[PDB]
Amino acid sequence: MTTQAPTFTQPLQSVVVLEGSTATFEAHISGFPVPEVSWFRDGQVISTSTLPGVQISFSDGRAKLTIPAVTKANSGRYSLKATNGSGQATSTAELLVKAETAPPNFVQRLQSMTVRQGSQVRLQVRVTGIPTPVVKFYRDGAEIQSSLDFQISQEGDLYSLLIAEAYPEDSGTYSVNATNSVGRATSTAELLVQG
């Protein structure tokens, strides 16, 4: 129960949290008298006003800072100052907020099919990915340009290559390629038109 400068028995930890999830900075501080605790983020003092919804507690030498819904703006370098009459102790980490992403995933893949001549062929895929993938069609390896009766259309995550009337020359290997900043996915199918 004698005077002792503040010290960090448990310092802060640099954390990578996904946006939308909760984040928590905690630290165990010892020093008599019980030090005063202040939180900081990039030079600005942290309170309920600076960062809304934040929760700060100090119980039994355990200081904790909790952000319920972390956003991209909540990132930066966080510091923790402990102060009494005998000295000052400061621990610092930083919060890294990565936006939620997802590699391209073919919910519905291309299906190889054999049809008669003059029939209507519909090649269809449902692609998911964050950020929204760049979906490109390919015929025998070459990129397909949206022709008139060889049309490529999109509705949300659904992509369709509609052939009005299929002919034997339309036979080949059709493939769709979806790429974004986190991955690449491909689907491939063979089409055969008989006459």
CA distances from 10 to 92, 115, 166, 183 (A): 12, 69, 70, 38
Is the domain of 69 the same as that of 120? no
Q: Resolution, rounded to a tenth of an Å?
A: 3.0
Token pair, residue 80, equals 């923790």
Q: Are 175 and 186 in contact (CB under 8 A)?
A: yes
Q: Is 2 exposed, middle or buried (0-12, 13-18, 19+ CB in 10 A)?
A: exposed
Q: Is the dihedral of CA 134, 135, 139, 140 positive or negative?
A: positive
Deposited experimental method: X-ray
CATH of the domain at 131: 2.60.40.10
Token pair, residue 173, equals 């290997």
The two beta strands, 113-116 and 183-194, are parallel
Is the domain of 9 the same as that of 94? yes
Is the domain of 78 the same as that of 160? no
Is the domain of 91 the same as that of 104? no
Is the domain of 67 the same as that of 103? no
Q: Are 5 and 29 in contact (CB under 8 A)?
A: no
Report the distance separating Cα 26 and Cα 18, nearest Å: 18
Q: Which of 60, 78, 98 is the last residue of a domain?
A: 98
Q: Give the domain extent around 8.
A: 1-98
- Please tell me the total count of domains within the chain: 2
Q: What's the DSSP call for residue 41? A: E
Q: Are 23 and 15 in contact (CB under 8 A)?
A: yes
Residue with tokens 């491939």: 188
Q: Are 84 and 34 in contact (CB under 8 A)?
A: yes
